[PDB]
């Protein structure tokens, strides 16, 4: 590598199964609070004060 001009730089499939599973596995924790809950617009100055 070292100026191989890579995309999000990366030279193996092994780091593709590091980018996606470490985003996703700290994403699925975020989903476990915010799944199955939608809508409820509020029209205020940054309330978004739902729980």
């Amino acid at each position: 590598n070292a100026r191989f001009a890579n995309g999000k730089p990366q030279s193996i499939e092994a780091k593709y199964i590091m980018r996606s599973p470490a985003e996703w596995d700290r994403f699925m924790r975020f989903m476990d609070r915010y799944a199955e809950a939608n809508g409820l617009g509020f029209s205020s100055x940054x309330x978004x004060x739902x729980x």
């Binding site: 100026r3 001009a5 890579n6 995309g7 999000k8 730089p9 617009g41 029209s43 205020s44 100055x45």
Partner: protein, 100 residues
């Protein structure tokens, strides 16, 4: 002077709040729909502004090139590169040395 006049207009003689008699141009700053519509208008005009260069290089008089073959010259860009791995491979490149 056209843009200067209308700016002096709506700062001196204009509706101070647009949402009284102009609901199309009025907003709340909290209307998430209406603020995205003003985005989505302005994104189209930046979009049409970018093809306006693509019209300039391909069709209307061409665009100057230093890598132009046999000398720097105004030339028409007949075949640009629309491969997204080439194109978005600039954005996902590193910002450090020689990547750039």
């Amino acid at each position: 002077a056209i843009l200067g006049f209308g700016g002096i207009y709506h700062s001196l003689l204009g509706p101070d709040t647009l949402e009284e008699s102009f609901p199309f141009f009025g907003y709340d700053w909290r209307d998430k729909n209406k603020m995205t519509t003003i985005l989505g208008i302005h994104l189209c005009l930046l979009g049409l502004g970018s093809f306006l260069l693509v019209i300039k290089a391909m069709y209307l008089g061409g665009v100057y090139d230093t890598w132009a073959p046999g000398g720097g010259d105004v030339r028409y860009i007949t075949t640009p590169t629309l491969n997204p791995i080439v194109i978005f491979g600039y954005v996902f490149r590193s910002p450090f040395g020689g990547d750039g």
